[PDB]
Amino acid sequence: KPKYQVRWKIIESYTFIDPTQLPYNEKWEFPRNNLQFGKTLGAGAFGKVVEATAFGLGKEDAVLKVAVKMLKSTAHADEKEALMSELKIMSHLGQHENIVNLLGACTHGGPVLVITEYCTYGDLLNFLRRKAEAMLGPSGRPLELRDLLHFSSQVAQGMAFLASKNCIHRDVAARNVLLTNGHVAKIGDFGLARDIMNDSNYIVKGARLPVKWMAPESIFDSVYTVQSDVWSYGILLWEIFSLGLNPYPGILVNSKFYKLVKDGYQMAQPAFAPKNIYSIMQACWALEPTHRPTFQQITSFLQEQA
Ligand SMILES: Cc1cc2cc(Oc3ccnc(Nc4cccc(CS(=O)(=O)NCCN(C)C)c4)n3)ccc2[nH]1
């Protein structure tokens, strides 16, 4: 039996902020009657994300497509509190080009609605898989290596922003990266729109955990830091440069798997990774967390390669 819990954490000193104690800045408030909902984009056991037209949003009074996060009508008070905490974290962090940004919220007069940017091309994992199939078909445009480097660089920039705000993501993976206009990548947390209870990428342990993405110190000691996010980012790189294979393909998560990772087992070079991109992956998988690259080092390196 899983609970709906706040994914991201903010470091205080590791001491973490209690997000329930953060303030909600009413500058974000938007009238719920000024949303016209469209299709549901995804739904899980606790809520869903629905596209909508927002009328008069922002300083320019834009009329635009947005995405709206919401809980099920039957949500417990504990879950409504978690959605508010997620809202407060987004307001605390500020905006960046390579994250899925907060645009507004509806907190009065009904259930809490969190309004974010809408990303026209959906998640990166499905995008890469569908593009791979489109490219094999002949036997819109095809992917090239520079596209993969751009996606990778853009995610690293968004993560460098989060790290600069002392924010830990804890579920870095291609399924949590979206592509927007111009195929620009943005990192976010879309667990609410994901069917996690029936998702083979989350393993029951202790909690449903994305074990194949997790650093050994997270698996064994439940330690989460920016450096454990860097490990997960290395797994994301492997996803990108394999065009969306599952990590550790074909390997069952069991005691042997946990031991192998703790002892230094690493995936082999993906089919489309240049040697030095695989070397970055290996660097992200250093067993000593402080030996891993920073997101700024990753960003600068990948920007150069692109
Ligand atoms: C794996 C997954 C991540 C995820 C994130 C979600 O929250 C968000 C948040 C912001 N944006 C979007 N944009 C968005 C999400 C899913 C589908 C689409 C439309 S599409 O499939 O890429 N192209 C349209 C296809 N049809 C019209 C032909 C956009 N999802 C919503 C559902 C999600 N599913």
Numbering used by the authors: 543 to 555, 561 to 686, 747 to 813, 815 to 914
Q: What does the paper behind this entry write?
A:
Sulfatinib is a multi-target drug that selectively targets FGFR, collection stimulating factor 1 receptor (CSF-1R), and vascular endothelial growth factor receptor (VEGFR). To achieve this, we determined the crystal structures of sulfatinib in complex with FGFR1 and CSF-1R using X-ray crystallography. Sulfatinib exhibits dramatic conformational changes upon FGFR1 and CSF-1R except for the hinge-interacting pattern. Notably, the flexibility provided by the oxy linker of sulfatinib emerges as a critical factor for the FGFR and CSF-1R targeting, allowing sulfatinib to adapt and adopt multiple binding conformations in response to different kinase bindings.
These results demonstrate that sulfatinib inhibits CSF-1R by locking the protein in an inactive state, classified as a type II inhibitor. The indole group of sulfatinib in CSF-1R is flipped out of the hydrophobic pocket via an oxy linker. We supposed that sulfatinib may bind to CSF-1R as the mode with FGFR1, but the indole group of sulfatinib may clash with Lys616 and Phe797 of CSF-1R, which means it may have a higher-energy barrier to attain the FGFR1-sulfatinib binding mode. As to CSF-1R, the R-spine is broken and Phe797 is displaced by Trp550 from the juxtamembrane domain (JMD), thereby forcing the DFG-out flip and forming an inhibitory R-spine. The kinase activity inhibition assay results showed that sulfatinib preserved a remarkable inhibitory effect on CSF-1RT663I with IC50 value of 4 nM. It seems that there is a large space available to accommodate sulfatinib without steric clash with the isoleucine side chain, supporting the high sustainability of sulfatinib against CSF-1RT663I mutation as determined by biochemical assay.
